[PDB]
Write a protein that binds this DNA or RNA. Structure first.
Length: 105
RNA sequence: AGGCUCGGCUGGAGCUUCCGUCAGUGCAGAUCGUAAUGGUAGUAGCAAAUAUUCAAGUUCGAUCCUUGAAGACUGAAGUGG
């Protein structure tokens, strides 16, 4: 129940609407972290380097409109951490976003 | 009245009555000299030179140090040697 994995679609276009040109990609990363925090209910969120690569794939200002991610809430192997759970976000390549919903993995 | 005596506390080595006489003898000012301190005030402000992000390392502690990945810039009359 605590260790879980779900596939989500994030509307980065709606999330980062109105942001300045030289902040769109960092703000998209922040919005992905916020989305993972809200959905998986974990304060500790880590973004995979491949997801960062995808978000920055088209430069700093022309961020992709949608992104398909796999949020995997897992146990914190480091026992002295403040919290026992953290979320890891990974990039799911996707060419057609139509009809996709939130999925359990 | 100029000032003075005593009491209490602090301090640790000098001070004092009266008689003569002497003077570098009395400060609120001089945009006075010098030293220190306020309100202003946690205020003005820290805005030129395109730009940083992710993961990890070390550390009591990392936007800023180091490694890797990505994205940009100087653009050879260079931010190079």
């Amino acid at each position: 129940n605590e260790v879980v994995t779900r596939e989500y679609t994030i509307h980065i276009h709606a999330r980062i609407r109105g942001i300045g040109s030289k902040k769109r990609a960092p703000r998209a990363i922040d919005e992905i972290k916020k989305f993972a925090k809200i959905q998986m209910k974990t304060n500790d969120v880590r973004v995979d380097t491949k997801l960062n690569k995808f978000i920055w794939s088209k430069g700093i200002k022309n961020v992709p409109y949608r992104v398909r991610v796999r949020l995997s809430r897992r146990r914190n192997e480091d026992e002295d951490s403040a919290q026992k759970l953290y979320t890891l976000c990974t990039y799911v390549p996707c060419t057609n976003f139509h009809g996709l919903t939130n999925v359990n993995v």
